[PDB]
Each structure stands twice: as structure tokens, then as C-alpha cells.
Amino acid sequence: MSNYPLHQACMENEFFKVQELLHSKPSLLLQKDQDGRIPLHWSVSFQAHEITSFLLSKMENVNLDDYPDDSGWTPFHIACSVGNLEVVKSLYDRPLKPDLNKITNQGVTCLHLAVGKKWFEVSQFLIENGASVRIKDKFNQIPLHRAASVGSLKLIELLCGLGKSAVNWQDKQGWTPLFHALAEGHGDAAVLLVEKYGAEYDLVDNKGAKAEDVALNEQVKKFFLNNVVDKLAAALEHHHHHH
């Protein structure tokens, strides 16, 4: 990025340079580049811890939420997507706390990002500090959908257990987390949702397919059906449903 030397210096991790720039023209601290990002976005993006900390010390009275880039990403969104818990703690541990549910242009939250990248610590930190687990992006997907999509059992537990997340919410495509788990071939994850978190598997998507029908392959599907009770034969019927 030419015309934005300070943002560039953050990307390269040239801490000394960053300091020289802020001294020659302080006004660059909160300047927005072509993509609407300010210096803090790049330091956090390239995990330049030394620079980030310095930027924050100069942003004493700045609410990170007032700085979403053109994509809707605030520097806090970047931290959580990157996964460095320590940086996330430094961005969050400030007088003006970020709205943990703030969304991107496409309706995704920090927890949506952290979970989609399989960052356990960061996801736990968010959930423990108040982040909601029931916010649906522009696709009507809550984090758990992603957790099932990347096939992370740890994340499913965290969201459904501590997070008390809903399990049978259907997205724009009519998919519940279960569908996502099977579509990606995560057999064990699909069985966990059903066996431990009451995920209903008799629902149909917008095309008429049951979760088992969108299985990645025969084995994945074979493994699901053989570890979830054959409802057709079940003596009784569920006495609880979940949600």
C-alpha cells in the first residue's frame, strides 16, 4: 500500500519505522486506507504484538467498534479470526469494551470467526465474557453451524454445553448443524450432536433432503445411521426435544 506508509509499516512489522511515522505525522494513527482499515487492523492481522500494543497505548479513548473496515471488520474481528488469545485479551481488556456481538457486513460475529478457524481458547474467552452463541449471519447460521462444518467436537461441546446453544436451528438452506457435519464427512461430530445434544435428524432441507442424504459419502452416512437409533423401530418416542 503506497499512500499509506504507516499501514504498510505495520504489515512488515517495522516497529521502529511505525514509531518514526507517528512522530513525523501523528494524524496517521486513525487514518483509513483504501479498504477502510486503520493501522491497528494490519498489526493485529500480521500479529505484530509489539506494534499493536504501541498503537493501543495511543488509542486510550478509542472504541474499536467505531472502526469497522469497508468489509465490516473491526480490529477485534481480526484478532479473533487470527486466533492469538493474548492479542484478543489486550484488545478486550480496555476501558471501552467491544460489543462482543458486533457483526460484519455479512452478519458474522467474532465467535463465528474464532469457531470457524477452530480456535478453542479464543472461542471460550468470548463465550465466557458474554458473547452470544445464537446470532445468525446473513445465512441464518449461528457458530455451531460452523463448528459442525469444520467437524470440531471440542467446539460443539463448548457451544452446546457451556454455551447452551440451540441445536436444531435451520439456516437459509434449511440446514441444521447436523447437515453441515455430515456434508463435510465428520461422522463422529454428527453422532455427537444427535446422541449427546438432542439434534433431530428427521428434518428436511429446502430440497427435501434429510441430513443423512447430504452425507459426504456412503461410509460417513453408513456410520451415522448405525450410531443413531433406528426411529422406525423405536418403541417409544422422544419425551423431550431441545430448544
User: Which DSSP string do the residues of 130-179 spell out, in sequence order?
Assistant: T--S----TTS--HHHHHHHTT-HHHHHHHHTTT---S----TTS--HHH
Angstrom distance (rounded) from CA 106 to CA 103? 7
Residue-range domain boundaries for the chain? 1-228
SS3 state at 210: strand
- The CATH number given to 1-228 is 1.25.40.20
Count of CA atoms in the C-beta half-sphere (13 A) of 90? 23
Give me 9's grid cell: 509499516
Contact 90, 55 (CB under 8 A): no
Evaluate the CA torsion angle 115, 134, 148, 137 in order and state its sign.
Answer: negative
Long-range CB contacts for residues 25-31, cutoff 8 Å, separation at least 24: 29/55, 29/58, 29/59, 30/59, 30/62, 30/67, 31/4, 31/6, 31/7
* Residue 152 backbone zone (phi > 0: left; psi -120 to 50: alpha; other: beta): beta
The reported resolution of this PDB entry, expressed in Å, is 2.5
Provide the experimental method for this PDB entry: X-ray
Taking the CB of residue 121, how many other CB atoms lie within 10 A of it?
A: 14
Q: On the CB side of 162, how many CA atoms lie within 13 Å of its CA? A: 16
3-state DSSP percent of the chain in helix, strand and coil, to 5:
50, 0, 50
